[PDB]
Design a protein around this ligand. Sequence first.
Ligand SMILES: [Zn+2]
Length: 283
Amino acid sequence: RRLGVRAWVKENRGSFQPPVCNKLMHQEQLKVMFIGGPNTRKDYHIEEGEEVFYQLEGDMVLRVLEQGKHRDVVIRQGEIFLLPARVPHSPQRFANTVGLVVERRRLETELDGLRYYVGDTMDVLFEKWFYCKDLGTQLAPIIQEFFSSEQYRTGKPIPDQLLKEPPFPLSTRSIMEPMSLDAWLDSHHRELQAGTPLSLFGDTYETQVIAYGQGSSEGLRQNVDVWLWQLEGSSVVTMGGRRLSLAPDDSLLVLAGTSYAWERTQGSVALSVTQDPACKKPL
Ligand SMILES: [Zn+2]
């Protein structure tokens, strides 16, 4: 069950380049995916859940539509960033890079969208909305459809092929600045090692990425998955009658409906990643 993150990336190296630049490490309630390049594109993904971006190897550019403006969000190696719900985003990836993206299984009620815009404007050229189960797989025919369309050929939209309005309001939020994960962890070393687990992004998001130093934790049975990633030092997770030693860079997925006990050593640093749909933000 324990997976060394860079060891898993090495074993699956060939997956992080064209034609399919991604491989899911975990694919149940929590989608833990690793993506490579090159992949330069104009499609904008829209979803009701949030997306955690971390650059393991090399840099990437996340193009976003923020408060009526086009913005390029540069995410450098070692940087972490959280995208809120319903923000249109277009990830740009380069050769020999590896990024981690964390997203969640959609609720039966949630719709995903894919949009292409007219030139550099906010006018929609082409769009398709769908119920997402396996994103990359469902996106491929929509993209092929776009490249075969009158819309792509002419650069002009077909009004009858556009929705009157999106199925939900698009985000009105200001987009955060990506931050160095290591710099953030070192700056909060005193609070972390005093036994205070800390949320990287706070309570205004559904997602909870929490940093832990030395201490004890009890994981209760939840209807959501939890991904643990040991960054520095070691810890021990007691789960399903087994004691699993997490060495530096080891990760463990705690499946929904499983309880655990976590014992972290002095000077150790680890993360937990949770995207509980019950924590979805209103408005
Ligand atoms: Zn996305």
